[PDB]
């Protein structure tokens, strides 16, 4: 590990600097180094880890979609053959994306999930595990695609079960998990009815729990609830 010689606190500090500079690749590398120190992450540190990798892989996914679209058009009736280059470059981006997903899943498996006992950490990491299997599923085609989809589903499901037992319906992690699992159902698992049902139930149960919250907790929560509503409007 190239971060093995840097203090944990310095890695955290530099991840925050990288976030301010929108240097998400650096941010992710700093937080990988911090995780590899072997200590549990605090609430704030977990968010630095998730945001860094979400942004790295988000950019990869956007680029992959651009290239996959060009590739699909290159294979339509009437398109001039243009050689292997579009496929090759799409594959290059895809392999880099898979590498980042594998790295995140490895951090979760070694050993963030096994040491996470509190609901807010365990649900968080299992959500991330579902998310990174979902990104693998978006580009998957071969013998293991179903296993990749089922790995995403299994991680999201375990997170869901814990979240419903241990967290209030307005908890932002619980809400975000439900949002993303609903998207998994719609876009990955060919289950739009399940996606809609989950988004609606989650929204309605959160609405009914808002009265228990402070102004600041209400602000959080309502923000993710609006994303659930946005997706429902797209889907209905």
């Amino acid at each position: 590990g190239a971060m093995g010689s840097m203090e944990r606190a310095s890695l955290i500090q530099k991840a925050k600097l990288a976030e301010q500079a929108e240097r998400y690749e650096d941010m992710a590398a700093f937080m990988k180094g911090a995780v590899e120190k072997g200590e549990e992450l605090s609430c704030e540190e977990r968010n630095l880890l998730s945001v860094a990798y979400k942004n790295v892989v988000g950019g990869q996914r956007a680029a992959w979609r651009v290239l996959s679209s060009i590739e699909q058009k290159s294979n339509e009736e009437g398109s001039e053959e243009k050689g292997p280059e579009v496929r090759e470059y799409r594959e290059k981006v895809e392999t880099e994306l898979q590498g980042v997903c594998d790295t995140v899943l490895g951090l979760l498996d070694s050993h963030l999930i096994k040491e996470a006992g509190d609901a807010e950490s365990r649900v968080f990491y299992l959500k991330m595990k579902g998310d990174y299997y979902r990104y693998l599923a978006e580009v998957a085609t071969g013998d293991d695609k179903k296993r990749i989809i089922d790995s995403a589903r299994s991680a999201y499901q375990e997170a869901m079960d814990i979240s419903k037992k241990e967290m209030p319906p307005t908890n932002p992690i619980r809400l975000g998990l439900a949002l993303n699992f609903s998207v998994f159902h719609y876009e990955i698992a060919n289950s739009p009815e399940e996606a809609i049902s989950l988004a609606k139930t989650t929204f309605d149960e959160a609405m009914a729990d808002l009265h228990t919250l402070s102004e600041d907790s209400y602000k959080d929560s309502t923000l993710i609830m609006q994303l659930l509503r946005d997706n429902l409007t797209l889907w209905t």
């Binding site: 998310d131 975000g176 949002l179 993303n180 719609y186 876009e187 993710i224 994303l227 997706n231």
Partner: peptide
């Protein structure tokens, strides 16, 4: 695309 967090 739909929203995720």
């Amino acid at each position: 695309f739909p929203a995720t967090v």
